Assembly symmetry: C3
Homo-oligomer: 401 residues x 3
Amino acid sequence: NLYFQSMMTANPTSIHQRLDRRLSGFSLEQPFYTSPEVYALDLQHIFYKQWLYAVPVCQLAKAGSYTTLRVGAYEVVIVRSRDGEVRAFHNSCRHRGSLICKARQGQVAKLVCPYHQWTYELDGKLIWANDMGPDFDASKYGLKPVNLRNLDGLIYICLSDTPPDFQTFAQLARPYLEVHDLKDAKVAFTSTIIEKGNWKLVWENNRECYHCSSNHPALCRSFPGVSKKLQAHFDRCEAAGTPAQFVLAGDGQYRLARMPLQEKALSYTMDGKAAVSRHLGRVAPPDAGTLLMFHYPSTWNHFLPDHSLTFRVMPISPTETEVTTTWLVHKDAVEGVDYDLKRLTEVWIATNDEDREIVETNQQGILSPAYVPGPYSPGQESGVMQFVDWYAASLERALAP
Amino acid sequence: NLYFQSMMTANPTSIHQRLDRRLSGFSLEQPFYTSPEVYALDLQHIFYKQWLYAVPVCQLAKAGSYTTLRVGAYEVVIVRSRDGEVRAFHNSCRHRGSLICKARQGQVAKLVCPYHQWTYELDGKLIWANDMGPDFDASKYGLKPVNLRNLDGLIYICLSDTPPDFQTFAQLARPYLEVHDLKDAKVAFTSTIIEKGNWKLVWENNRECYHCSSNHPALCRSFPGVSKKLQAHFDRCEAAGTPAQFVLAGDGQYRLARMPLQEKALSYTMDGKAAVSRHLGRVAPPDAGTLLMFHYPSTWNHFLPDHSLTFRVMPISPTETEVTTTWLVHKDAVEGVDYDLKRLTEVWIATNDEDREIVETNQQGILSPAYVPGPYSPGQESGVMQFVDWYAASLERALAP
Amino acid sequence: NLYFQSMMTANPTSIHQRLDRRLSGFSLEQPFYTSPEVYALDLQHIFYKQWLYAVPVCQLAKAGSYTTLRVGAYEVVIVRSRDGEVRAFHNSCRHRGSLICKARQGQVAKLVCPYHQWTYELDGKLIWANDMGPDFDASKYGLKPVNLRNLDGLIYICLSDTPPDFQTFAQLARPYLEVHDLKDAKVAFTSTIIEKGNWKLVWENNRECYHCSSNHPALCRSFPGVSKKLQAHFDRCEAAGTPAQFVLAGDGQYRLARMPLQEKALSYTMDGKAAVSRHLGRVAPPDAGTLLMFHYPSTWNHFLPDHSLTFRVMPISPTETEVTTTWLVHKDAVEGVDYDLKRLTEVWIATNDEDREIVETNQQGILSPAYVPGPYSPGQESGVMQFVDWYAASLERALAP
Ligand code: FES
Ligand code: FES
Ligand code: FES
Ligand SMILES: [Fe+3]
Ligand SMILES: [Fe+3]
Ligand SMILES: [Fe+3]
């Protein structure tokens, strides 16, 4: 309701003027975080144009296996086709538009629409349509495809018919990710939450640890030009065949780095030790730490020697964002034997809840018409500024006539 | 929320251009089913201008008896006046605007506003107003009336001050309906549900049985130029004094036809036999089947030899529609003796729930910005096309300067 | 949902033309009570520009004590500063905008933001900010203040940087209020409710007792040029040092009058007797009755010899209004000894619920597109007209170029 109150008296969003006068050292003016007009632009120009992380490919290990997701108002279905390729389609029947797959996941022989049973093969092709006449050309009524790439076991999609370059990022990232053998994972746990903040607020909060000391007791135990200590850490990883070195995109979109953990910590556990005894991938040394990877606007990620976590950021409304956290473990690791579910997840479930509380409290103060932009900490918040620059530049380029 | 997501990035509704390029062989472009702009037009120009089925007149059998309903944002009260006429008024007090009748139904001597007790007679006339002065003319402050017609026991209303012609339809329909003696009915059961689809989607789904084979196991047992078999069926009805022949409005608004049922079925029951042993009206022969009647935009109807069902379609929002199903039986049929409530209603309660699920699943895929119009089946969906033509033509004529 | 339905087909709000043709003898045209456009104007020009009652100052009796409230989309914090002054600030951190105080009330040493711990003194001054560099000037990043006045124990605020004159009203009211010793009160009970009516509807209903006879059985027992009887009542109060005489603002904004109660009643109790045995203030005589005070747009008030009630009116949306009723009693009156909570509150809790029902029923009829303005009763509704004139004039003056 704060959102509605705030809406009423807001000055016009005059987006070009706001972008023109924006200073990189400062939080965004209110309508970036609260307005429906900027939200529609963020959808149209960011989420509907960039590559987005969807799910781990291991969720689609089986024959005829499918999983569905919403991206803004798009309903997407991702399916393992007959020929073993993974493909993605718009989950909308070409007859009258019905969703075809209604469950979050399943297995099918064919994609059969529940309304009137137009039946499609798993590559999208319409192979039967009831009583449509002889003037019906089934070749014009195949499922609409959705661009898809496999990033070394992690499925990404893009809803534009003209997607940007994914290959540069894929080629940069393979070395770092291939060593995790993600295609041999299974999902041990998924947690989906809604945060009552604009997606930008979720990213700003992710891209600093300025707030961590006070707000993240559990994570702090394990989670901490290149400094001396740090290069030394990259050197042990790389000496052992485990790529680790800081890579930052030219345009700031993604970043990869294998960072050391605090103290004697090996993993994101309350005791600091490995959560899973049967490791996912061949990372060495054991204290190689965490491979941080972000790709804007959809995902941040921690790949550890024993297990991995992917984080998917999706917009729900101007002041709501769905965060999906997926724990990946070796496909033959056994719950109750090789890992304990509580021990595996408790750290990040608590961290996520603490972040959500912070983001939500932040959003509420921002909705005040008295909110003005404020200065980011150069020492503590340069990753926030780095995110906000990427956003603003993406938006300016999409708005260019 | 899908509805909100979808809204953001939608292209302008440019209604004239959409209507201009519309082809009758195809489902509507997205904003017809999802947009608030077309929804307001549908209210203003369709629901607020056409005659609408409201309720069976038997709900108003008693002296001073009233029933209320909402039509979009209109609150209407229908009352049996002192002189035995049924009249309808705007349920808004002429003083400061309060609802007068707050319950769904009741009986009163007078209509007394609960705020300040301005008191009206049952023909709308204000007969007392407290301490209003001598410069108060009560004759200017009678309830505002609502146009009303009685279709042979079924009350219809129209919220325009200039209603279209109802008499043509009334004169066509009397022969078909008079034989059901609807004025001697009682309501044995009413079911009200909300479907999460645009009202148009509810009508398209009603006007085909393309989806029935797969989706309606219960109904299929009883529910199936003029063909040979069919004319033969009309001939037995009409030979016996029971009008049955297909009548379709010039402008496509309504339609009446007494159709045969499957197999040995006499009624909409799980066993195919009559639900009520004491029949409503004098229909013959017993296997005369069902009198189908639709009148756009508000109602479809099945009148059987033993009992009848009316269906009222009312818009709630761009993606919500209230369907009210009323089972009418002879006023002296006794629950537990002449009929069993479960046996009377189970078929259509399940059918309605199956239709609602289908409509809702259809609406969700339509909200995808990838939804495009698709071709209707000429063999299976001509009634859908016939409905969509009536809608588009109604809207084009209202938009004409 | 009525609100949404109503919205769709409404004619433009053309506010100037509506104000131009407005007649003082008549209820407002629909969009004043139902539209989001007039709601935003009411926020921007009324609620965000006038002085508003916030809370009793006794809620802030302690060192470091604070209480928070929302006014439209503003989040405000009121704090007892180190030096004993009460001050109000925008509850938004100057760093990235977070709420600082999250609870409704509490005590602090300092105002410490929960996100990153920027720490402020209780006068607003930022005294520590972590790792902001040497180019950080903390003097530019103090909390934004909110104008505040103390009306003889009752805290008022104003969100404009250029508040209107409060002193005239404060100087008129002190004599009437000082005798209640409000600074020595405590809150014995607070009740917060939401009424589903526009705030204007809540005020119109407050400003008449045209509806009371039928709708307020409990209150009627105690609640009833200057008439003879009435001047006689003011004369006993004033003879005894208790100011009582009718004072109405020049511009109609406020009004004060100590009115007599019915019968032998001394207080707002089911039995008519004093609710609290230990009196709040030094009012005499004992049957001095109730000091009525209203100040538009935020508050009406009953100050009795034994206890007092303040009523705070805040807008939530076009058809929702939060009413907060606070019972004040002497700070040393003891619950269970000097008063019984039920006996103290039952009359106004029931009255408020009856008013809310009436306002809600009124709002629903108003949402009908058939609602037209109607005539107010000159004898019974002149206070309603007096309120509506104040509103319209306030709005016209704010809209003046
Ligand atoms: S909507 Fe899919 S078969 Fe008809
Ligand atoms: S609103 Fe109906 S009598 Fe006043
Ligand atoms: S938002 Fe308050 S310290 Fe950062
Ligand atoms: Fe965090
Ligand atoms: Fe159906
Ligand atoms: Fe009242």
